[PDB]
Amino acid sequence: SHMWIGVISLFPEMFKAITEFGVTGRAVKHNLLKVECWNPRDFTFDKHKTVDDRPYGGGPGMLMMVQPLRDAIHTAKAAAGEGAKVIYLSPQGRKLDQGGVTELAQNQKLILVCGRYEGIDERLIQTEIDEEWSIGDYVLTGGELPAMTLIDAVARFIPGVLGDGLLDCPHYTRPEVLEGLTVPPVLMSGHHEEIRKWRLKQSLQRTWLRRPELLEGLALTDEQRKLLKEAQAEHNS
Amino acid sequence: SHMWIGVISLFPEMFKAITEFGVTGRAVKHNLLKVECWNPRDFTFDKHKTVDDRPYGGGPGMLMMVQPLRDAIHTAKAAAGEGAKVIYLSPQGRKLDQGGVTELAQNQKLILVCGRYEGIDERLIQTEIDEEWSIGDYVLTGGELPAMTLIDAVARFIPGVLGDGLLDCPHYTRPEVLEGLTVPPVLMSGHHEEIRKWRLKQSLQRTWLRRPELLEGLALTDEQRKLLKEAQAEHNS
Numbered sequence: 001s002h003m004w005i006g007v008i009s010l011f012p013e014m015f016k017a018i019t020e021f022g023v024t025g026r027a028v029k030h031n032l033l034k035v036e037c038w039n040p041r042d043f044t045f046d047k048h049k050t051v052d053d054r055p056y057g058g059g060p061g062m063l064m065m066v067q068p069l070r071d072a073i074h075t076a077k078a079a080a081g082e083g084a085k086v087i088y089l090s091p092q093g094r095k096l097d098q099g100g101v102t103e104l105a106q107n108q109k110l111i112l113v114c115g116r117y118e119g120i121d122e123r124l125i126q127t128e129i130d131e132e133w134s135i136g137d138y139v140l141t142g143g144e145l146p147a148m149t150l151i152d153a154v155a156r157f158i159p160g161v162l163g164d165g166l167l168d169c170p171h172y173t174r175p176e177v178l179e180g181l182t183v184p185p186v187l188m189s190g191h192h193e194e195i196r197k198w199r200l201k202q203s204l205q206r207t208w209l210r211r212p213e214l215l216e217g218l219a220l221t222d223e224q225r226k227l228l229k230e231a232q233a234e235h236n237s
Numbered sequence: 238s239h240m241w242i243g244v245i246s247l248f249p250e251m252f253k254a255i256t257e258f259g260v261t262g263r264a265v266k267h268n269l270l271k272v273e274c275w276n277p278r279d280f281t282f283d284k285h286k287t288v289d290d291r292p293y294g295g296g297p298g299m300l301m302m303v304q305p306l307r308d309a310i311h312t313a314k315a316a317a318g319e320g321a322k323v324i325y326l327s328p329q330g331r332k333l334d335q336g337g338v339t340e341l342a343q344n345q346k347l348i349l350v351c352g353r354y355e356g357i358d359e360r361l362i363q364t365e366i367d368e369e370w371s372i373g374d375y376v377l378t379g380g381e382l383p384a385m386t387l388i389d390a391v392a393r394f395i396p397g398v399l400g401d402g403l404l405d406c407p408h409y410t411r412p413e414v415l416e417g418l419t420v421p422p423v424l425m426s427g428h429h430e431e432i433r434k435w436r437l438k439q440s441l442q443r444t445w446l447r448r449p450e451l452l453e454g455l456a457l458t459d460e461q462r463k464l465l466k467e468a469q470a471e472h473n474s
């Protein structure tokens with residue numbers, strides 16, 4: 001179930017951050033994940049390899065120049081063959097969450113278009129882009145970090161890359177006592193069922209306290225309902 | 238108003254993605270932004286430079302080993318001096334948005350702790366971390382991409398790095414006609430006020446259609462109320 005991701009970027013060397021390091025670097029070396037980049041600058045024809053252009057209507061910014069970007073996209077589409085979804089990363093896109101990650105991970109091929117400057121021509125979005133996605137409600141200097149974020153997130157779903165809507169439970173490792181703070185005795189008990197229930201209760205409690213809206217989106221099991229009620233009762237002393 | 242950011246990461250070379258390229262790369266070269274990394278592996282003492290450890294209570298994963306990570310954090314804190322806020326990036330943190338970015342950008346010094354494996358010891362969060370932040374409701378293989386995302390976002394607020402709660406308007410550049418699609422005539426009119434109002438109306442319309450909840454958080458001006466009503470009337474034909 002390997003995955004191919006084509007990238008359109010003025011700064012393809014940025015993607016070394018995910019292709020050369022850690023779990024995603026291993027995925028690439030083991031051919032579980034392939035990331036292939038095209039740079040609009042390589043598709044320019046003028047002496048100074050111009051990749052930006054002035055916005056109609058004026059304004060302080062520049063846009064990506066249409067012809068080099070369009071040609072790079074077309075080249076990526078030809079390399080991908082049939083079935084590749086083309087994604088543009090921008091704050092105007094659908095907000096990414098883990099459900100959206102699972103949806104995107106169903107694709108065997110993606111092409112990610114990374115904007116720079118003030119963005120890209122709206123008509124390219126209409127004619128070349130299948131979906132717009134955002135990694136969050138904030139503005140960055142380029143689409144490369146959003147693209148890498150998406151790649152990393154979906155790569156976790158590729159079989160072989162790694163070894164319920166709630167926040168994670170607390171985790172502990174050595175030493176047993178750290179600046180006077182002890183490990184919860186249950187985690188030392190060797191009682192697997194008690195440990196499982198403790199972790200679940202902690203996850204429910206943390207989700208309730210920090211992100212209560214996330215709970216509203218869940219259909220809690222009988223056990224989860226019980227443990228959440230216990231946690232809420234204890235919180236209220 | 239330059240900014241110093243200390244980073245704790247097992248993969249410091251990942252940060253070349255922001256320190257060597259584009260607007261953030263320029264910020265670094267021009268001394269507007271300094272990014273300084275410490276690697277827990279450099280703080281190990283065993284032959285194999287062990288940086289992970291087993292979780293109490295069992296489970297399939299590993300945590301970052303406490304001693305090398307703690308020592309790296311302390312070294313970063315000493316380098317930062319007084320006033321540095323220590324941030325841990327994780328899905329359990331406060332969700333980043335542009336308002337949160339503006340808040341974080343008020344700090345002259347930040348230290349960003351990048352988790353790997355299944356995370357870090359809860360007691361380190363208690364004893365070493367000032368704030369936990371998330372870049373979005375999804376899970377990544379490491380905190381480095383979230384840290385770089387945060388750095389890029391806050392760097393845009395540093396004076397010299399660059400040259401209202403609504404989504405951006407559409408942008409257009411050459412050519413005048415692209416695959417049969419024309420540039421809106423108003424943007425060619427040279428009428429600056431008409432162009433301003435068009436862009437604002439488009440932003441209001443796009444926010445309403447794609448992200449209506451964002452509108453609920455705004456106190457629209459009289460002009461914005463009018464243009465939004467116009468856009469909604471036109472949408473309803």
Ligand SMILES: NC(=O)c1ccc(NCC2CCCC2)nc1
Pocket residue numbers: 089090091114115116117118119120133134135136137138139140141142143146
């Ligand atoms: N939240 C996001 O997913 C996101 C995506 C792209 C971006 N910036 C580059 C785009 C902004 C103008 C040029 C393209 N910033 C933020």
Ligand SMILES: NC(=O)c1ccc(NCC2CCCC2)nc1
Pocket residue numbers: 326327328351352353354355356357370371372373374375376377378379380383
């Ligand atoms: N949404 C986020 O801001 C985010 C942060 C860190 C992360 N992964 C590394 C952490 C997860 C376990 C080890 C540390 N994933 C996602």
